[PDB]
Design an enzyme around this catalytic site. Structure first.
Site, mmCIF file in Angstrom:
data_model
loop_
_atom_site.group_PDB
_atom_site.id
_atom_site.type_symbol
_atom_site.label_atom_id
_atom_site.label_comp_id
_atom_site.label_asym_id
_atom_site.label_seq_id
_atom_site.Cartn_x
_atom_site.Cartn_y
_atom_site.Cartn_z
ATOM 1 C CG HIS A 1 34.430 33.128 33.420
ATOM 2 N ND1 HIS A 1 34.063 34.269 34.103
ATOM 3 C CD2 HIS A 1 33.447 32.225 33.649
ATOM 4 C CE1 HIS A 1 32.922 34.057 34.734
ATOM 5 N NE2 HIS A 1 32.527 32.823 34.476
ATOM 6 C CB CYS A 2 38.720 36.062 36.128
ATOM 7 S SG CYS A 2 40.089 36.336 35.010
ATOM 8 C CD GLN A 3 35.914 41.377 37.097
ATOM 9 O OE1 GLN A 3 36.621 41.559 38.088
ATOM 10 N NE2 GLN A 3 34.989 42.245 36.706
ATOM 11 C CB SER B 1 40.787 32.554 34.413
ATOM 12 O OG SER B 1 40.727 33.714 33.613
ATOM 13 C CD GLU C 1 33.961 41.286 33.192
ATOM 14 O OE1 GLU C 1 33.068 41.593 34.010
ATOM 15 O OE2 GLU C 1 35.110 41.786 33.200
#
Ligand SMILES: CSc1scc2c1-c1nc(SCC(=O)C(C)(C)C)ncc1CC2
Length: 147
Positions: free
Chosen positions: A88-90, A96, A15
């Site tokens: 992307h994720c976190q 991802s 993120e």
């Protein structure tokens, strides 16, 4: 902010990485995959990127395999027109990283462990998820059986 270059056109971040607009333009990115349900599409109102959201959580019940083919067609669309794609994720990039490895298994013919060693070499911090691990193992078997 580190956007890890897995392939010359495929980038992996979290993120925090996804909010650096200047670096994304330096990397010639035009495509973004957001693998969360709740984060915004960063910079959406600037009209600079093509976006895709795969609404997943980082749980032991989430199905990510269902999104594989959808994600591969988006990756190949950026690949074929000379642009970069950010997925992307976190924090621990678990979600991802699953999609990135799945792409490498299918479109590079790498085994699952060779794909993981390749990704882990460029982005050393990757949080494990036994559920996503199990789905890549079944994905490897379906590749080897022509399915
Ligand atoms: C295909 S992953 C794999 S294959 C063999 C091993 C591993 C592994 N992976 C991770 S973290 C990466 C993940 O869990 C996801 C990307 C699936 C979210 N930690 C420890 C290990 C131990 C050995």
């Amino acid at each position: 902010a580190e956007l890890t270059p897995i392939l010359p056109f495929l980038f992996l971040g979290n993120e925090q990485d996804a909010q650096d607009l200047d670096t994304m333009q330096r990397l010639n990115i035009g495509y973004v995959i957001n693998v969360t349900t709740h984060l915004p599409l960063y910079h959406y109102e600037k009209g600079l990127f093509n976006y895709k959201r795969l609404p997943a959580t980082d749980s032991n019940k989430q199905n990510l395999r269902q999104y594989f083919e959808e994600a591969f067609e988006f990756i190949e669309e950026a690949h074929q027109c000379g642009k970069g794609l950010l997925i992307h994720c976190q924090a621990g990039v678990s979600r991802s990283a699953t999609i990135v490895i799945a792409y490498l298994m299918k479109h590079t013919r790498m085994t699952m462990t060779d794909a993981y060693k390749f990704v882990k070499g460029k982005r050393p911090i990757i949080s494990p998820n036994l559920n996503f691990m199990g789905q890549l193992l079944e994905f490897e078997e379906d590749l080897n059986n022509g399915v």
